[PDB]
Design a protein around this nucleic acid. Sequence first.
RNA 1: CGAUGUCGGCUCAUCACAUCCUGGGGCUGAAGUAGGUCCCAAGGGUAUGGCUGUUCGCCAUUUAAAGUGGUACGCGAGCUGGGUUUAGAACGUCGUGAGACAGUUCGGUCCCUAUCUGCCGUGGGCGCUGGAGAACUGAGGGGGGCUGCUCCUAGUACGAGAGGACCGGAGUGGACGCAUCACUGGUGUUCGGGUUGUCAUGCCAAUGGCACUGCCCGGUAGCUAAAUGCGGAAGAGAUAAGUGCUGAAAGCAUCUAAGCACGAAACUUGCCCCGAGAUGAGUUCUCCCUGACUCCUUGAGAGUCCUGAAGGAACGUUGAAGACGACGACGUUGAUAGGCCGGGUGUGUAAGCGCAGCGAUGCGUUGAGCUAACCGGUACUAAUGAACCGUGAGGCUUAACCU
RNA 2: AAUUCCUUGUCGGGUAAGUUCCGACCUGCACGAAUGGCGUAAUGAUGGCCAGGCUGUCUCCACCCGAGACUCAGUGAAAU
RNA 3: ACACAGGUGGUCAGGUAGAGAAUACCAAGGCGCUUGAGAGAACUCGGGUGAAGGAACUAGGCAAAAUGGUGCCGUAACUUC
RNA 4: AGGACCGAACCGACUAAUGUCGAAAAAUUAGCGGAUGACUUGUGGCUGGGGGUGAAAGGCCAAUCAAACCGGGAGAUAGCU
Lengths: 114, 55, 119, 208, 122
Amino acid sequence: SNIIKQLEQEQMKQDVPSFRPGDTVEVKVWVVEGSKKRLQAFEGVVIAIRNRGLHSAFTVRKISNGEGVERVFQTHSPVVDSISVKRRGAVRKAKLYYLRERTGKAARIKERLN
Amino acid sequence: AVQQNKPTRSKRGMRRSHDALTAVTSLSVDKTSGEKHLRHHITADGYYRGRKVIA
Amino acid sequence: MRHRKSGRQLNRNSSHRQAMFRNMAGSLVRHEIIKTTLPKAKELRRVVEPLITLAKTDSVANRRLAFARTRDNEIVAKLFNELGPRFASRAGGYTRILKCGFRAGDNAPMAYIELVDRS
Amino acid sequence: IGLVGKKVGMTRIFTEDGVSIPVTVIEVEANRVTQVKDLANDGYRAIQVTTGAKKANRVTKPEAGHFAKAGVEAGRGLWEFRLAEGEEFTVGQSISVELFADVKKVDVTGTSKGKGFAGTVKRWNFRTQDATHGNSLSHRVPGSIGQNQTPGKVFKGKKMAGQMGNERVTVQSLDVVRVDAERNLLLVKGAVPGATGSDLIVKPAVKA
Amino acid sequence: MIQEQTMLNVADNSGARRVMCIKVLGGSHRRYAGVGDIIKITIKEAIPRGKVKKGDVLKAVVVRTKKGVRRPDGSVIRFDGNACVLLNNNSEQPIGTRIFGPVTRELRSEKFMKIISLAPEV
RNA sequence: CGAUGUCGGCUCAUCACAUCCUGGGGCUGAAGUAGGUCCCAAGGGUAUGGCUGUUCGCCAUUUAAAGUGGUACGCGAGCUGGGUUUAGAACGUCGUGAGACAGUUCGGUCCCUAUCUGCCGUGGGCGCUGGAGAACUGAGGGGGGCUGCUCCUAGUACGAGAGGACCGGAGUGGACGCAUCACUGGUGUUCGGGUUGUCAUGCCAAUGGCACUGCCCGGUAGCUAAAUGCGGAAGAGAUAAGUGCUGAAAGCAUCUAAGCACGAAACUUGCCCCGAGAUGAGUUCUCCCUGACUCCUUGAGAGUCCUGAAGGAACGUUGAAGACGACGACGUUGAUAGGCCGGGUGUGUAAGCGCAGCGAUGCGUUGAGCUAACCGGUACUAAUGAACCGUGAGGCUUAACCU
RNA sequence: AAUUCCUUGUCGGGUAAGUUCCGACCUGCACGAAUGGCGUAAUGAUGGCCAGGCUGUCUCCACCCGAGACUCAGUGAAAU
RNA sequence: ACACAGGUGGUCAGGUAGAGAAUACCAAGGCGCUUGAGAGAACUCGGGUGAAGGAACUAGGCAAAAUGGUGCCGUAACUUC
RNA sequence: AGGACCGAACCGACUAAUGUCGAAAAAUUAGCGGAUGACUUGUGGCUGGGGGUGAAAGGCCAAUCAAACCGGGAGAUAGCU
Ligand SMILES: [K+]
Ligand SMILES: [Mg+2]
Ligand SMILES: [Mg+2]
Ligand SMILES: [Mg+2]
Ligand SMILES: [Mg+2]
Ligand SMILES: [Mg+2]
Ligand SMILES: [Mg+2]
Ligand SMILES: [Mg+2]
Ligand SMILES: [Mg+2]
Ligand SMILES: [Mg+2]
Ligand SMILES: [Mg+2]
Ligand SMILES: [Mg+2]
Ligand SMILES: [Mg+2]
Ligand SMILES: [Mg+2]
Ligand SMILES: [Mg+2]
Ligand SMILES: [Mg+2]
Ligand SMILES: [Mg+2]
Ligand SMILES: [Mg+2]
Ligand SMILES: [Mg+2]
Ligand SMILES: [Mg+2]
Ligand SMILES: [Mg+2]
Ligand SMILES: [Mg+2]
Ligand SMILES: [Mg+2]
Ligand SMILES: [Mg+2]
Ligand SMILES: [Mg+2]
Ligand SMILES: [Mg+2]
Ligand SMILES: [Mg+2]
Ligand SMILES: [Mg+2]
Ligand SMILES: [Mg+2]
Ligand SMILES: [Mg+2]
Ligand SMILES: [Mg+2]
Ligand SMILES: [Mg+2]
Ligand SMILES: [Mg+2]
Ligand SMILES: [Mg+2]
Ligand SMILES: [Mg+2]
Ligand SMILES: [Mg+2]
Ligand SMILES: [Mg+2]
Ligand SMILES: [Mg+2]
Ligand SMILES: [Mg+2]
Ligand SMILES: [Mg+2]
Ligand SMILES: [Mg+2]
Ligand SMILES: [Mg+2]
Ligand SMILES: [Mg+2]
Ligand SMILES: [Mg+2]
Ligand SMILES: [Mg+2]
Ligand SMILES: [Mg+2]
Ligand SMILES: [Mg+2]
Ligand SMILES: [Mg+2]
Ligand SMILES: [Mg+2]
Ligand SMILES: [Mg+2]
Ligand SMILES: [Mg+2]
Ligand SMILES: [Mg+2]
Ligand SMILES: [Mg+2]
Ligand SMILES: [Mg+2]
Ligand SMILES: [Mg+2]
Ligand SMILES: [Mg+2]
Ligand SMILES: [Mg+2]
Ligand SMILES: [Mg+2]
Ligand SMILES: [Mg+2]
Ligand SMILES: [Mg+2]
Ligand SMILES: [Mg+2]
Ligand SMILES: [Mg+2]
Ligand SMILES: [Mg+2]
Ligand SMILES: [Mg+2]
Ligand SMILES: [Mg+2]
Ligand SMILES: [Mg+2]
Ligand SMILES: [Mg+2]
Ligand SMILES: [Mg+2]
Ligand SMILES: [Mg+2]
Ligand SMILES: [Mg+2]
Ligand SMILES: [Mg+2]
Ligand SMILES: [Mg+2]
Ligand SMILES: [Mg+2]
Ligand SMILES: [Mg+2]
Ligand SMILES: [Mg+2]
Ligand SMILES: [Mg+2]
Ligand SMILES: [Mg+2]
Ligand SMILES: [Mg+2]
Ligand SMILES: [Mg+2]
Ligand SMILES: [Mg+2]
Ligand SMILES: [Mg+2]
Ligand SMILES: [Mg+2]
Ligand SMILES: [Mg+2]
Ligand SMILES: [Mg+2]
Ligand SMILES: [Mg+2]
Ligand SMILES: [Mg+2]
Ligand SMILES: [Mg+2]
Ligand SMILES: [Mg+2]
Ligand SMILES: [Mg+2]
Ligand SMILES: [Mg+2]
Ligand SMILES: [Mg+2]
Ligand SMILES: [Mg+2]
Ligand SMILES: [Mg+2]
Ligand SMILES: [Mg+2]
Ligand SMILES: [Mg+2]
Ligand SMILES: [Mg+2]
Ligand SMILES: [Mg+2]
Ligand SMILES: [Mg+2]
Ligand SMILES: [Mg+2]
Ligand SMILES: [Mg+2]
Ligand SMILES: [Mg+2]
Ligand SMILES: [Mg+2]
Ligand SMILES: [Mg+2]
Ligand SMILES: [Mg+2]
Ligand SMILES: [Mg+2]
Ligand SMILES: [Mg+2]
Ligand SMILES: [Mg+2]
Ligand SMILES: [Mg+2]
Ligand SMILES: [Mg+2]
Ligand SMILES: [Mg+2]
Ligand SMILES: [Mg+2]
Ligand SMILES: [Mg+2]
Ligand SMILES: [Mg+2]
Ligand SMILES: [Mg+2]
Ligand SMILES: [Mg+2]
Ligand SMILES: [Mg+2]
Ligand SMILES: [Mg+2]
Ligand SMILES: [Mg+2]
Ligand SMILES: [Mg+2]
Ligand SMILES: [Mg+2]
Ligand SMILES: [Mg+2]
Ligand SMILES: [Mg+2]
Ligand SMILES: [Mg+2]
Ligand SMILES: [Mg+2]
Ligand SMILES: [Mg+2]
Ligand SMILES: [Mg+2]
Ligand SMILES: [Mg+2]
Ligand SMILES: [Mg+2]
Ligand SMILES: [Mg+2]
Ligand SMILES: [Mg+2]
Ligand SMILES: [Mg+2]
Ligand SMILES: [Mg+2]
Ligand SMILES: [Mg+2]
Ligand SMILES: [Mg+2]
Ligand SMILES: [Mg+2]
Ligand SMILES: [Mg+2]
Ligand SMILES: [Mg+2]
Ligand SMILES: [Mg+2]
Ligand SMILES: [Mg+2]
Ligand SMILES: [Mg+2]
Ligand SMILES: [Mg+2]
Ligand SMILES: [Mg+2]
Ligand SMILES: [Mg+2]
Ligand SMILES: [Mg+2]
Ligand SMILES: [Mg+2]
Ligand SMILES: [Mg+2]
Ligand SMILES: [Mg+2]
Ligand SMILES: [Mg+2]
Ligand SMILES: [Mg+2]
Ligand SMILES: [Mg+2]
Ligand SMILES: [Mg+2]
Ligand SMILES: [Mg+2]
Ligand SMILES: [Mg+2]
Ligand SMILES: [Mg+2]
Ligand SMILES: [Mg+2]
Ligand SMILES: [Mg+2]
Ligand SMILES: [Mg+2]
Ligand SMILES: [Mg+2]
Ligand SMILES: [Mg+2]
Ligand SMILES: [Mg+2]
Ligand SMILES: [Mg+2]
Ligand SMILES: [Mg+2]
Ligand SMILES: [Mg+2]
Ligand SMILES: [Mg+2]
Ligand SMILES: [Mg+2]
Ligand SMILES: [Mg+2]
Ligand SMILES: [Mg+2]
Ligand SMILES: [Mg+2]
Ligand SMILES: [Mg+2]
Ligand SMILES: [Mg+2]
Ligand SMILES: [Mg+2]
Ligand SMILES: [Mg+2]
Ligand SMILES: [Mg+2]
Ligand SMILES: [Mg+2]
Ligand SMILES: [Mg+2]
Ligand SMILES: [Mg+2]
Ligand SMILES: [Mg+2]
Ligand SMILES: [Mg+2]
Ligand SMILES: [Mg+2]
Ligand SMILES: [Mg+2]
Ligand SMILES: [Mg+2]
Ligand SMILES: [Mg+2]
Ligand SMILES: [Mg+2]
Ligand SMILES: [Mg+2]
Ligand SMILES: [Mg+2]
Ligand SMILES: [Mg+2]
Ligand SMILES: [Mg+2]
Ligand SMILES: [Mg+2]
Ligand SMILES: [Mg+2]
Ligand SMILES: [Mg+2]
Ligand SMILES: [Mg+2]
Ligand SMILES: [Mg+2]
Ligand SMILES: [Mg+2]
Ligand SMILES: [Mg+2]
Ligand SMILES: [Mg+2]
Ligand SMILES: [Mg+2]
Ligand SMILES: [Mg+2]
Ligand SMILES: [Mg+2]
Ligand SMILES: [Mg+2]
Ligand SMILES: [Mg+2]
Ligand SMILES: [Mg+2]
Ligand SMILES: [Mg+2]
Ligand SMILES: [Mg+2]
Ligand SMILES: [Mg+2]
Ligand SMILES: [Mg+2]
Ligand SMILES: [Mg+2]
Ligand SMILES: [Mg+2]
Ligand SMILES: [Mg+2]
Ligand SMILES: [Mg+2]
Ligand SMILES: [Mg+2]
Ligand SMILES: [Mg+2]
Ligand SMILES: [Mg+2]
Ligand SMILES: [Mg+2]
Ligand SMILES: [Mg+2]
Ligand SMILES: [Mg+2]
Ligand SMILES: [Mg+2]
Ligand SMILES: [Mg+2]
Ligand SMILES: [Mg+2]
Ligand SMILES: [Mg+2]
Ligand SMILES: [Mg+2]
Ligand SMILES: [Mg+2]
Ligand SMILES: [Mg+2]
Ligand SMILES: [Mg+2]
Ligand SMILES: [Mg+2]
Ligand SMILES: [Mg+2]
Ligand SMILES: [Mg+2]
Ligand SMILES: [Mg+2]
Ligand SMILES: [Mg+2]
Ligand SMILES: [Mg+2]
Ligand SMILES: [Mg+2]
Ligand SMILES: [Mg+2]
Ligand SMILES: [Mg+2]
Ligand SMILES: [Mg+2]
Ligand SMILES: [Mg+2]
Ligand SMILES: [Mg+2]
Ligand SMILES: [Mg+2]
Ligand SMILES: [Mg+2]
Ligand SMILES: [Mg+2]
Ligand SMILES: [Mg+2]
Ligand SMILES: [Mg+2]
Ligand SMILES: [Mg+2]
Ligand SMILES: [Mg+2]
Ligand SMILES: [Mg+2]
Ligand SMILES: [Mg+2]
Ligand SMILES: [Mg+2]
Ligand SMILES: [Mg+2]
Ligand SMILES: [Mg+2]
Ligand SMILES: [Mg+2]
Ligand SMILES: [Mg+2]
Ligand SMILES: [Mg+2]
Ligand SMILES: [Mg+2]
Ligand SMILES: [Mg+2]
Ligand SMILES: [Mg+2]
Ligand SMILES: [Mg+2]
Ligand SMILES: [Mg+2]
Ligand SMILES: [Mg+2]
Ligand SMILES: [Mg+2]
Ligand SMILES: [Mg+2]
Ligand SMILES: [Mg+2]
Ligand SMILES: [Mg+2]
Ligand SMILES: [Mg+2]
Ligand SMILES: [Mg+2]
Ligand SMILES: [Mg+2]
Ligand SMILES: [Mg+2]
Ligand SMILES: [Mg+2]
Ligand SMILES: [Mg+2]
Ligand SMILES: [Mg+2]
Ligand SMILES: [Mg+2]
Ligand SMILES: [Mg+2]
Ligand SMILES: [Mg+2]
Ligand SMILES: [Mg+2]
Ligand SMILES: [Mg+2]
Ligand SMILES: [Mg+2]
Ligand SMILES: [Mg+2]
Ligand SMILES: [Mg+2]
Ligand SMILES: [Mg+2]
Ligand SMILES: [Mg+2]
């Protein structure tokens, strides 16, 4: 409804960059070490993008040391500082959940370069 | 399953008190022809709301 | 419990339910009037009336879509040639339900469904 | 006292530190007082209010008159609130959402979403009997319902299948987040009963 | 969401390769552990040179879960393997000298500050 | 004995108190911590596993606790059938033998559509004394009542030290309940796509059928938990055990005989829900009807005629309401449903067409095309002018008023 | 032990925990040599036990698709 | 006993895929099973999917799930070879 | 070559669910065993009730079996209901 839409639209940050799934994104995140306020980084492949306006989100997968990590960011959260894109993948699917099953060479994806 | 001992006329009747089905008591009249029919239904000849819409 | 749901099951499986509308929608376009059960009539609006919108823009894609639904080139020929331009001005509401009593053999509520023109 | 308001779905508010708080958006239009009950006539002190705007042909004469005694416009439905001794109101007065600008927590009453005829598993959290291992036509059934000869009867309030929901339920001490005066809203933390469009009686938390 | 019979890979280098959760501590009828909860462990598979032999009953902390951890933003952090770090029953404190793979923020609560210092991420 | 289904398990429970935890107290060989025993207290709570048919028991690991019992050793017209207790077979043993043995061993049909009572839901009828629509009151009933840890008070009292509080107060859990779908997810045979076999639309191309949705990959709304909010309270009344004050009988003494205070998760309220069929049928507000003749065995009587109100029901379009009734929205002085339009979302670059390459195929047009239950609009289709039930100022007897 | 009563014998293995299982001990209540004894490869819709894989079996149930159940019309039983 | 979800011997053996008379989809030819129409509760039946865990179920992995084809490489104790 | 292997027809009937006044006085659905043999099956013979037949369960002998069925002795007998 308009009443809700009006409450959403005011909160939503009006400067989110357009990233597709299969893009290697470097999300920067605010973290708090009690008194401190650090900017952590999280570079990884964008596996899923849920678009719902204010309730939008996206999953970033990162094969860090040891085993793989999967982080769901709430796009219009104030905790997410910036969303810089590095590589753009030529993938023809909305959700890349098959990358969980794969590792290493199978898990890598072709770049767009259009 | 199975009754312990048989019910009466009385109870059978008491149960049937709600089985009595209701009449219509609400027949319409077509504006042009003046034929009786159910509300929001066409007529027997083929009218509805004073206008032929059927062969 | 079915809150905010749509579509009548009509005591059929899906594949059947999809077929019997595919036939019935074909029959409505051909004969322009149909006698069917009041629910089936109400649910036939959601199948046919989109084919009439699809039919307004005559091209290829839409003809092939209107053939992907229906599956008969006669019905696709009567759409686009007649019912496309004939319902050009009118914005939705191409069909009309009129209740016509009850079916003898089962007491099912009947209904005539027809295109809003017949002229 | 309390105010009536339509439920208008759910959203979240992101606080600048990070926390996203899930909020129910309750639109609270001008609740206008149709009647003031007192100890002389009624034997207790209260106010009857109304809200919304009902079309004139849908409102009946017995209520159309009832609104004309006050002088207010015919709102959709009537609700009554008990006064807490100190406060006193007048007929034809319009109570706005600015009463909750002071308060922190609120009890929200509404009509829960109707689940229809619910079985014991859904209604009472009864445990499903073994899904196999010989089980014969008795997976989700309630099991026993009593003892034997001794009572020779099922006891009252025995948890059985039946109508679930569509019942008036109250969620207590929900934290009020924002009180928007201009759009006439009242954002409360958490979830309140009933579907979007259902009427809610919001009032200050009794359990302080 | 670790429970009785859940097998866990071991994050630290104590010796255990695979362990099994035999009880979730801190309440009656408590179904699950996760995030940074204490669990009772049995070692089902250990390496030869490790500090802890097979079939030893000791405590551990869950450091990673596949179910994941919710932040207060509504966001979630999931992993591709449930993982834990072994501890000394009564004394607590980790047996292993070093910890492999990342560990979450919600593990930060005084007693496990040794576990966070050794971990290479988060 | 013209049949009352016998152990154990599951489901579902319910009561007792001879209390396992939690609450309150006396004594203590009670310094503190922790006990020991006893008293009052039944509100709530009261493991998961290994072995075994087991009940029990032992064992591992938890827990504040892992209570003892009754209820046909609760519960088979609710489930199970491991055990016991049919017919097969074997071992040991007894018997010359047929066979036999709470000795063992392997295998071995568990039926019933609910009339009544009861119970959970949900309506129709009439009543409540003119009728009708609302909003309450509350007699009465139900639900809820669990608790850990951490941290402050405080390393304070206590204590040689080691250890280590009462009483207050905050946080945060486990379990459990209520709600909800904003998030995280599940589902999503009505949305999109990939794909194998084959058949079809003349054929190519493109679709469609069938193969469990053919198999898969994603997924809108809804429903949902594992997801996120909230809850058990402080408060008061009267007390139990117990502690007292004044104070006799009994110069004293003694908590009591006059009298007077404290005193617990129990009890009565407080919190949530139902609740005037509460026949003792309540209260407030509003609305509507203010024409006559006939018959009488003079009744609160049967009619004739003119009027038909408020309102209701019926019918239709319907719903986050629902088995059916019911409940709520709307019926042209209209957004009730469908369509339609716009958005969103989802899928992931349609078709034709061009270009590249021998061909598979690749780009380009193109984040295109298609998009269910969603959001905002829009009378285009369907919600009809009526008819229908419901009446005509509402009994007698007092008392206050009152002209 | 398909044989063992006392008995869940005692010891060992496997399990966090094993009245079952496997190996061994002999105190054989009441084994024993064609009513055959002891071995054993192969075979078994055979009995017992353990592991991997896999799973709604379960923690703990959720949603979906069909057939009934439910309402309307027609027909119309039964035990008792 | 029924226009009964049973039993009943021989002969004929088309296409595509396939080892095949298996199976799938079709041809010839034959049928839609003699109550329907709605609704879309609990519960029952027959199925589909399932976060995290993975036998913790239970007398017992009963039941489901899983494995599955062809070619090639490779294949242990033990054996009556 | 084979009482060989896998596997349809055919013969069987291990498990489970459904059904239990059934669709069916023994079936159905999903899996299951044998499937060139001590196989299976059509047609016609033969064996008769203390008798047959039995790879032996007291199995089978027309939905009947520790002694079939029909008629007769026969109104057996009943200290029992
Ligand atoms: K305290
Ligand atoms: Mg009797
Ligand atoms: Mg009657
Ligand atoms: Mg009836
Ligand atoms: Mg709808
Ligand atoms: Mg709608
Ligand atoms: Mg609809
Ligand atoms: Mg419908
Ligand atoms: Mg039908
Ligand atoms: Mg039907
Ligand atoms: Mg199909
Ligand atoms: Mg549409
Ligand atoms: Mg469109
Ligand atoms: Mg269009
Ligand atoms: Mg509903
Ligand atoms: Mg259900
Ligand atoms: Mg259970
Ligand atoms: Mg179960
Ligand atoms: Mg059975
Ligand atoms: Mg049964
Ligand atoms: Mg059965
Ligand atoms: Mg079943
Ligand atoms: Mg039953
Ligand atoms: Mg039954
Ligand atoms: Mg609070
Ligand atoms: Mg839980
Ligand atoms: Mg060990
Ligand atoms: Mg050991
Ligand atoms: Mg007798
Ligand atoms: Mg009897
Ligand atoms: Mg018995
Ligand atoms: Mg016994
Ligand atoms: Mg049990
Ligand atoms: Mg229970
Ligand atoms: Mg006592
Ligand atoms: Mg005692
Ligand atoms: Mg005691
Ligand atoms: Mg005690
Ligand atoms: Mg306590
Ligand atoms: Mg206390
Ligand atoms: Mg004390
Ligand atoms: Mg007493
Ligand atoms: Mg108790
Ligand atoms: Mg009591
Ligand atoms: Mg009680
Ligand atoms: Mg109380
Ligand atoms: Mg309780
Ligand atoms: Mg085991
Ligand atoms: Mg057990
Ligand atoms: Mg123990
Ligand atoms: Mg403890
Ligand atoms: Mg006990
Ligand atoms: Mg007794
Ligand atoms: Mg007894
Ligand atoms: Mg007992
Ligand atoms: Mg019993
Ligand atoms: Mg018992
Ligand atoms: Mg019983
Ligand atoms: Mg029993
Ligand atoms: Mg039964
Ligand atoms: Mg048995
Ligand atoms: Mg059995
Ligand atoms: Mg047995
Ligand atoms: Mg038996
Ligand atoms: Mg025998
Ligand atoms: Mg015996
Ligand atoms: Mg013995
Ligand atoms: Mg068997
Ligand atoms: Mg069995
Ligand atoms: Mg059987
Ligand atoms: Mg029935
Ligand atoms: Mg009752
Ligand atoms: Mg009711
Ligand atoms: Mg009533
Ligand atoms: Mg009445
Ligand atoms: Mg009346
Ligand atoms: Mg009344
Ligand atoms: Mg009155
Ligand atoms: Mg009145
Ligand atoms: Mg009234
Ligand atoms: Mg009320
Ligand atoms: Mg009220
Ligand atoms: Mg109570
Ligand atoms: Mg201190
Ligand atoms: Mg100090
Ligand atoms: Mg001193
Ligand atoms: Mg301390
Ligand atoms: Mg203490
Ligand atoms: Mg919970
Ligand atoms: Mg939503
Ligand atoms: Mg999803
Ligand atoms: Mg799917
Ligand atoms: Mg398609
Ligand atoms: Mg292809
Ligand atoms: Mg083909
Ligand atoms: Mg064809
Ligand atoms: Mg062709
Ligand atoms: Mg082609
Ligand atoms: Mg093409
Ligand atoms: Mg076909
Ligand atoms: Mg088929
Ligand atoms: Mg599928
Ligand atoms: Mg397909
Ligand atoms: Mg719930
Ligand atoms: Mg939570
Ligand atoms: Mg709480
Ligand atoms: Mg108190
Ligand atoms: Mg004195
Ligand atoms: Mg004194
Ligand atoms: Mg007192
Ligand atoms: Mg308490
Ligand atoms: Mg009420
Ligand atoms: Mg009265
Ligand atoms: Mg009244
Ligand atoms: Mg009044
Ligand atoms: Mg008059
Ligand atoms: Mg009269
Ligand atoms: Mg008249
Ligand atoms: Mg009238
Ligand atoms: Mg009139
Ligand atoms: Mg009227
Ligand atoms: Mg009404
Ligand atoms: Mg009706
Ligand atoms: Mg209606
Ligand atoms: Mg409808
Ligand atoms: Mg409906
Ligand atoms: Mg009815
Ligand atoms: Mg209802
Ligand atoms: Mg009504
Ligand atoms: Mg009513
Ligand atoms: Mg209604
Ligand atoms: Mg109303
Ligand atoms: Mg109307
Ligand atoms: Mg108009
Ligand atoms: Mg109007
Ligand atoms: Mg309008
Ligand atoms: Mg609308
Ligand atoms: Mg308008
Ligand atoms: Mg539409
Ligand atoms: Mg449209
Ligand atoms: Mg999109
Ligand atoms: Mg493109
Ligand atoms: Mg392209
Ligand atoms: Mg294209
Ligand atoms: Mg396509
Ligand atoms: Mg060209
Ligand atoms: Mg070319
Ligand atoms: Mg080009
Ligand atoms: Mg492009
Ligand atoms: Mg798109
Ligand atoms: Mg659109
Ligand atoms: Mg729509
Ligand atoms: Mg709309
Ligand atoms: Mg617009
Ligand atoms: Mg107009
Ligand atoms: Mg207009
Ligand atoms: Mg018009
Ligand atoms: Mg008129
Ligand atoms: Mg009208
Ligand atoms: Mg009228
Ligand atoms: Mg009349
Ligand atoms: Mg009258
Ligand atoms: Mg009159
Ligand atoms: Mg009067
Ligand atoms: Mg009056
Ligand atoms: Mg009067
Ligand atoms: Mg009078
Ligand atoms: Mg023994
Ligand atoms: Mg033993
Ligand atoms: Mg031993
Ligand atoms: Mg030993
Ligand atoms: Mg041990
Ligand atoms: Mg042992
Ligand atoms: Mg076992
Ligand atoms: Mg042995
Ligand atoms: Mg031995
Ligand atoms: Mg030994
Ligand atoms: Mg020796
Ligand atoms: Mg021997
Ligand atoms: Mg022997
Ligand atoms: Mg000899
Ligand atoms: Mg011999
Ligand atoms: Mg001999
Ligand atoms: Mg032998
Ligand atoms: Mg031997
Ligand atoms: Mg041997
Ligand atoms: Mg051998
Ligand atoms: Mg051997
Ligand atoms: Mg061997
Ligand atoms: Mg054999
Ligand atoms: Mg065998
Ligand atoms: Mg067996
Ligand atoms: Mg075996
Ligand atoms: Mg056994
Ligand atoms: Mg296993
Ligand atoms: Mg493995
Ligand atoms: Mg649940
Ligand atoms: Mg369905
Ligand atoms: Mg059905
Ligand atoms: Mg039927
Ligand atoms: Mg039916
Ligand atoms: Mg009927
Ligand atoms: Mg009927
Ligand atoms: Mg009869
Ligand atoms: Mg009889
Ligand atoms: Mg015959
Ligand atoms: Mg037939
Ligand atoms: Mg037949
Ligand atoms: Mg048939
Ligand atoms: Mg056969
Ligand atoms: Mg023949
Ligand atoms: Mg031949
Ligand atoms: Mg063929
Ligand atoms: Mg071929
Ligand atoms: Mg075939
Ligand atoms: Mg065909
Ligand atoms: Mg043909
Ligand atoms: Mg033909
Ligand atoms: Mg024929
Ligand atoms: Mg034919
Ligand atoms: Mg047909
Ligand atoms: Mg027929
Ligand atoms: Mg039918
Ligand atoms: Mg209905
Ligand atoms: Mg449904
Ligand atoms: Mg259904
Ligand atoms: Mg429903
Ligand atoms: Mg249903
Ligand atoms: Mg049944
Ligand atoms: Mg089912
Ligand atoms: Mg099934
Ligand atoms: Mg499948
Ligand atoms: Mg299933
Ligand atoms: Mg499945
Ligand atoms: Mg799962
Ligand atoms: Mg999924
Ligand atoms: Mg999974
Ligand atoms: Mg595992
Ligand atoms: Mg596993
Ligand atoms: Mg295992
Ligand atoms: Mg367990
Ligand atoms: Mg077990
Ligand atoms: Mg168990
Ligand atoms: Mg066992
Ligand atoms: Mg077995
Ligand atoms: Mg199986
Ligand atoms: Mg599966
Ligand atoms: Mg399977
Ligand atoms: Mg499957
Ligand atoms: Mg497969
Ligand atoms: Mg292979
Ligand atoms: Mg091969
Ligand atoms: Mg080899
Ligand atoms: Mg070996
Ligand atoms: Mg052979
Ligand atoms: Mg076959
Ligand atoms: Mg066969
Ligand atoms: Mg044959
Ligand atoms: Mg056969
Ligand atoms: Mg069998
Ligand atoms: Mg058979
Ligand atoms: Mg096979
Ligand atoms: Mg076979
Ligand atoms: Mg074989
Ligand atoms: Mg074979
Ligand atoms: Mg063979
Ligand atoms: Mg041969
Ligand atoms: Mg013969
Ligand atoms: Mg013979
Ligand atoms: Mg003889
Ligand atoms: Mg003879
Ligand atoms: Mg015998
Ligand atoms: Mg004889
Ligand atoms: Mg004889
Ligand atoms: Mg005879
Ligand atoms: Mg006789
Ligand atoms: Mg004689």
